[PDB]
UniProtKB/Swiss-Prot annotation, chain B:
This is Transient receptor potential cation channel subfamily V member 6. The chain crosses the membrane at residues 301-321, 359-381, 397-416, 423-442, 463-485, 530-550. Residues 499-518 dip into the membrane without crossing it. GO terms for molecular function: calcium channel activity; calcium-activated cation channel activity; calmodulin binding; identical protein binding; metal ion binding. Residues 322-358, 417-422, 486-498, 519-529 are extracellular. The gene is Trpv6. ANK repeats lie at residues 18-48, 52-81, 90-119, 136-165, 169-210, 212-241. The chain holds residues 67 to 677 of 767 of the full protein. Glycosylated. Phosphorylation at Tyr-135 and Tyr-136 by SRC leads to an increased calcium influx through the channel. Probably dephosphorylated at these sites by PTPN1.
C-alpha cells in the first residue's frame, strides 16, 4: 500500500536528523562528555525536534541511557511533560517509553521529577489494527500491566494511577490483558489488579463493559482465551460438598447463558469467526447446558418443526404435477422437432372439483411463501446482508435458498392470472430448491449431521477449483469437435449440429454419462479419432480419477473440524429457538433462587469424580 | 426426565435447613465454642432432621469435622443407631460417611461407642445404575474395601464384620472390587480379603454365585477386566516342570470350558455386548482352547455343513427355473405394453416325467424349509427376540434372513394347490435371499472372513447416512424432470411418461447406468438442458465421488476392529456347534482326571519359552 511506505520514509528521516543535530547523536551514543560541553556554557537549543517531533529526552529514553537522561532532566526540567506530536506518534511521553523498555530506575526518576501518569497515547500506531503488531491500550498503567513488569505496576499505583480507564475503543485495563496472545503472565497479572480493587463504589471494576458492551468475562469467550476463561470461572464457582470421590459444585450461570436480554454468551459464540472462540463449548459449564437444552427440549421441537416442513413441500409438489393442460392449442408441428403436444389452460377453467381441490391446495402453499418472507425480511432488518453471502456455516446458505424458494412461488402467482406461456421456469426452480431445503433438517441428527457439512465444503472449496479446470478443457474440445463435424451430416451421428448443442454434448462426455459419438455404418473423418482419444484420456482417467483422490486427500485431513462444527451447528440451532419460541414451554434452564436463600441468580448443579486420594 | 433434576432440587434444601437450626450450622464449621453454648444449659433440640432426616453427627462427619463430632457423642450417645430416612439416602448411617472420607479416628471412636457394622444401606443413589457415579455396595465393609484403606479393612473385622454378606444385587465384597475402574489397589487388596477366609465347614468364598448365578471368576471375564483375570489365574495355574527356558504348565479348565450346564465363560463372553469382553480371548488359557477346538474339530465340521448348504440352494435353484408354463391362456393384445405371452399351468399338469423328476426337487427343497423352522424357533423361544433384531454381529442378521427365506418358500407352497397368479413375486425373494445366505459360511475362512464384516458394517453405518441424502435429491429432480417433459411426447424421448416411472428413471441416472436422455432429431425444451447439467454435477462428481471417499476414510479406521471381530466371529461358531452336535464325534477338550492321580478336574497342558 502507499500508506505503509510512509512509515518507512519517516523512520529513515527520523534517523537522518540523528546524524545531524549533534546532541541527539550525543544522546543516542550515551555520550555525556559532549553533552556537558554542548549545554553548560552555550546550549541554545534544548527544545529540539525530530521527524516525529520528539525531544532528546525521548531519544535518551528509547535507547537505555540512565546517564544521558540524568543530565537532560537536570538541564531542562520541563522536558518530562511535553509529548511527542506527529501523525503516527501522538501524545506519547517519556514515561511511556521508559515503561515498555522495563527501565525501573528511570521511571523512579521521572515520577520524582513529576510525570503525567494519565498521558493519553492517542497516536496512530497504537490503534487496535491488524497491520500493527502490539496493542497496549493508552495509559502508562496499561503499558506496564501487559508486558508483565509487576514491580512498575506497584510503582505507578503509589502515585495515583487510576485503574478505571477507558481508551478510544472503550476497553479498560482488564479488557487489554485478554488480548495479548503470549499470555504466560496474565493469569498472575490479573490478580494484582484486583488486589488494588479494595476501595471503590458499587461497580466492582469488572462490571464495566467496553464501548461495544462486553465485560471481561464476556470478552474472554469471544476472543478465544481458554487459559483466562477458566481463571475467571474459578471466581464464580461455588463448591457444595465433597463425599469421598463425589464433589458436587454449583455454577453461577448469570452470564454463561442467562438468555434473557440481548447479549448472552452462547449467542456471542456462534456469531463470531475465530477458530478458537468456538472451543469454549469444550469447557465444563457450557458443555452441560447445550446438551440439556438440546436433548430434553431442543431436539423434539426441532423435529416437529421439521416434520411439519416435509408435509408442506409435498403439498406444494402434489399441486405441482396436477397443472391444468390442454391438448395442442393451435399449431401443427411445422418444420421438424416440435415434440410438444400440450398447452396449459387459460385461467378460465377451475371447474371439475379435482381441479378445484388443488385450488385449496395451492392456497396452502401460497401463504406458506408469505410466512417465510415475513420471517426473513425482519432478518436483514436487524443484521446486514453480509450475514447471508458471508460463508458462515452456522446457519449457512440455507438462508438464501429458502428466500429464493419463497421468491419463486410468488412469480408463479404472477405468471398465473396474467396468462403468460413460460411458467415452468419458476416451478422447476421451485422444486429443486424446495426439496433440497429439507437438507437443513439433516442437522440435529446423530449420524447425518456431520455428513452434510462435507457436502457444503466440497461445493465451494473443492469444486470452485475444478469447474475452472472443467470449463477450459471443454471449451477446447467442444469447439474442436464442432469443426470436425461441421462438414458432416447431423442426421447420422448428429451429436453436434450447432455450437450451443456442442457444449452440452461435450460437457457430458467429460462426465462420462453419454456414451460417445460412434456410428459404424458410415466412415467417420480421421481427425475425429485422434482428437477424441486425447479427450478420453485427459477427462476419464486423468481428471475425474484425479478428483476422487482430491476428495480423499481432503477428507481425512479435516475430519476433526466437522466434529467441531457439527457441535456448534447444534448450539446455534438451540439458541435460535430460545429467542424465538415463547416462554410457556421452554423453562429457564437451571435452578433459580429465593425458594432457597440464594441471591436470585439462576444456578445449575454439577457433580463429578475426583480420582485421587 | 425431571428425576435427576429432582435430585438437584433436594440438594439445595439440605443447604437451606442447615442455615436454620444453628447447631447444624456449627456442625459444618466445627464451632466448638458455640456448640457448647447451644447444648449445656437448654439444648431442647438434639433430635434434628435435615432434608433427608440426617443428623448433626452426619454433618459433623460429612465435612471432616472430628472435634465437633467428639462433643456430639459425649452429649448425645444415641445418634449412631439411626439411619438417614429418605429415598435418596436410606439406611446410610453415620459409619458409612466416616469410612468413605477416610477418617481413621472417627471410625475408631464410633465403633468404640459401638455401631451396627452390618446394617444395610439402600438409598436410591446407591443402587447399581448407570446414571450414578460410584457403586460401593450396601454394607459398610464394602465401602472400606473399594477405596483402598487397608486399615479400616483390618479394623472392621476385629469388631465382628461378616465377610460373606450379599446385597440386593447378590454381590459379595469380592464381586464389587471387580467393578471399580481404576483398580490400582484392588488386586493388592484382593489378597487381604482371602487372608481372613479360613476355609471352614461352609464352602470357600469364591464359590458363591450372585443374584444372577455367576462366580467372581466369571464376573472378571464378563466385565472385561484383564488385571483381575490375570490375578485370578495364578491360583489355579499349576507348574509342571521347567527345562532351561522352557516351562510346561498345566491349567485348571474347570469352568472355562463349556462342558454342559450352559453358564460357562466361553459361553458368557460371546453373548454379551461389552466391548472389552472380547479382549479376554487373547489370554493364554483361553486362546489355546479355541484354536484346538476349531483347528482339529471346528474347521472341517463347519465346511462339510457348508457344502450341504450349497447343494440345498442349487436343488432349489434348478427347481425354480423349471416351472410349468402354457403359452398365453386366453387373452390377447392390450395394444401397447402387453409383452406377456406365457402363463403358468393350473395344477392339473404333472404329465411328462421331467416333472416327476422335479417333484422330488420341490420336496427336497420343502423339507429343508421346515428344518430351519425347527432349529431357529428354539432361539426366540429361548429369549432371542432382542438378539436377532439386536445387532450382535456374532451371529448377525443372517439369523433373520434365514427365517425370511424359509417363510417365502412356504408362501410358494401355499401358491401351488391354490392357483393364485402371483407366484413369481414370493419366489423372487426366495433366490436373492437364499443365495445371499451362503455368505454366513464365509465366516471360518482365513481370507474371505473379515471382508464380510466390512460389508455388514457399511450397510449399517456408512450407507444409511447416504440414502437419506439421496431420496431428498432424487425426489427433487424427478418431480423437476417430470414437469419439464409433461408437455412433450412420450412416443419420442419417453424417459418420463408418468410419475412413478419418473422416480425410477431418475434413480438410475443418479447411479450412471442409463445414458441420460437425448434425441438429436427433436428439439428439447430449453429448461431441460439447464437443469440436467446441474443434476449431473451433483450426482457424478459431488455425491458419488464423495461416497467413495466416505468409504476409504473409514476403512483404515476400522481395519483393526474387524480383526477383533473376526476372531470373535470364529469362537461364536465353535461354541454354537459344540452344544448342537452329540458328543460322540466330539471328544471333550483337555486331558482327563482320575485316570491319572489328579482329582477329576479336566486339565490342559501348554508349554512355552521364557527368555
Ligand atoms: Ca450406453
Ligand atoms: Ca454408460
Amino acid at each position: 500500500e502507499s500508506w505503509a511506505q510512509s512509515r518507512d520514509e519517516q523512520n529513515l528521516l527520523q534517523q537522518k536528523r540523528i546524524w545531524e543535530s549533534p546532541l541527539l547523536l550525543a544522546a543516542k551514543e550515551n555520550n555525556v562528555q559532549a553533552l556537558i560541553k554542548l549545554l553548560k556554557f552555550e546550549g541554545c537549543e534544548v527544545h529540539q525536534k525530530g521527524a516525529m517531533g520528539e525531544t532528546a529526552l525521548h531519544i535518551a529514553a528509547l535507547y537505555d541511557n540512565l546517564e544521558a537522561a540524568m543530565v537532560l532532566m537536570e538541564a531542562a526540567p520541563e522536558l518530562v511533560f511535553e509529548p511527542m506530536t506527529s501523525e503516527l506518534y501522538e501524545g506519547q511521553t517519556a514515561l511511556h517509553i521508559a515503561v515498555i523498555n522495563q527501565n525501573v530506575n528511570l521511571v523512579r526518576a521521572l515520577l520524582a521529577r513529576g510525570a503525567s501518569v494519565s498521558a493519553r497515547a492517542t497516536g496512530s500506531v497504537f490503534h487496535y489494527r491488524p497491520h500493527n503488531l502490539i496493542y497496549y491500550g493508552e495509559h502508562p498503567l496499561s503499558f506496564a500491566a501487559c508486558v508483565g513488569s509487576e514491580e512498575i505496576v506497584r510503582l505507578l499505583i503509589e502515585h495515583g494511577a487510576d485503574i478505571r480507564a477507558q481508551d478510544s475503543l472503550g476497553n479498560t485495563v482488564l479488557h487489554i490483558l485478554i488480548l495479548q496472545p503470549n499470555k504466560t503472565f496474565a493469569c498472575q497479572m490479573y490478580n494484582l489488579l484486583l488486589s488494588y480493587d479494595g476501595g471503590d463504589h458499587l461497580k466492582s471494576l469488572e462490571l464495566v463493559p467496553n464501548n461495544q458492551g462486553l465485560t471481561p468475562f464476556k470478552l474472554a469467550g469471544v476472543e478465544g482465551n481458554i487459559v483466562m476463561f477458566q481463571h475467571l470461572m474459578q471466581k464464580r464457582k461455588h463448591i457444595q460438598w465433597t463425599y469421598g470421590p463425589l464433589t458436587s459444585t454449583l455454577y453461577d450461570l448469570t452470564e454463561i447463558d442467562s438468555s434473557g436480554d440481548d447479549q448472552s454468551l452462547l449467542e456471542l459464540i456462534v456469531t463470531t469467526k475465530k477458530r478458537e472462540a468456538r472451543q469454549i463449548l469444550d469447557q465444563t459449564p457450557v458443555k452441560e447446558l447445550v446438551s440439556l437444552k438440546w436433548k430434553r427440549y431442543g431436539r423434539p421441537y426441532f423435529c416437529v418443526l421439521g416434520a411439519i416442513y416435509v408435509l408442506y413441500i409435498i403439498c406444494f409438489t402434489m399441486c405441482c404435477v396436477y397443472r391444468p393442460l390442454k391438448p395442442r392449442i393451435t399449431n401443427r408441428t411445422n418444420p421438424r422437432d416440435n415434440t410438444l403436444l400440450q398447452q396449459k389452460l387459460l385461467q378460465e377453467a377451475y371447474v371439475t372439483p379435482k381441479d378445484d381441490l388443488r385450488l385449496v391446495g395451492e392456497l396452502v402453499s401460497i401463504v406458506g411463501a408469505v410466512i417465510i418472507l415475513l420471517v426473513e425480511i425482519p432478518d436483514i432488518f436487524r443484521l446486514g446482508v453480509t450475514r447471508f453471502f458471508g460463508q458462515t456455516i452456522l446457519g449457512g446458505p440455507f438462508h438464501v435458498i429458502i428466500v429464493t424458494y419463497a421468491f419463486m412461488v410468488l412469480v408463479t402467482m404472477v405468471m398465473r392470472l396474467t396468462n403468460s406461456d413460460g411458467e415452468v421456469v419458476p416451478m422447476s426452480f421451485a422444486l429443486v430448491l424446495g426439496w433440497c431445503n429439507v437438507m437443513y433438517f439433516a442437522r440435529g441428527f446423530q449420524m447425518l449431521g456431520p455428513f452434510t457439512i462435507m457436502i457444503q465444503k466440497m461445493i465451494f472449496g473443492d469444486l470452485m477449483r475444478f469447474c475452472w479446470l472443467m470449463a477450459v478443457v471443454i471449451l477446447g474440445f467442444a469447439s474442436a469437435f464442432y469443426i470436425i463435424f461441421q462438414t458432416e451430416d447431423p442426421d447420422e451421428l448428429g451429436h453436434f449440429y450447432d455450437y450451443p448443442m456442442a457444449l452440452f454434448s461435450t460437457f457430458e462426455l467429460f462426465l462420462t454419462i453419454i456414451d460417445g459419438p460412434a456410428n459404424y455404418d458410415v466412415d467417420l473423418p480421421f481427425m475425429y479419432s485422434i482428437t477424441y482419444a486425447a479427450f478420453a484420456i485427459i477427462a476419464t482417467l486423468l481428471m475425474l480419477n484425479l478428483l476422487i483422490a482430491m476428495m480423499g486427500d481432503t477428507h481425512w485431513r479435516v475430519a476433526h473440524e466437522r466434529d467441531e462444527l457439527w457441535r456448534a451447528q447444534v448450539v446455534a440451532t438451540t439458541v435460535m429457538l430460545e429467542r424465538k419460541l415463547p416462554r410457556c414451554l421452554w423453562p429457564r434452564s437451571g435452578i433459580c433462587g429465593r425458594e432457597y436463600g440464594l441471591g436470585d441468580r439462576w444456578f445449575l448443579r454439577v457433580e463429578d469424580r475426583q480420582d485421587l486420594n
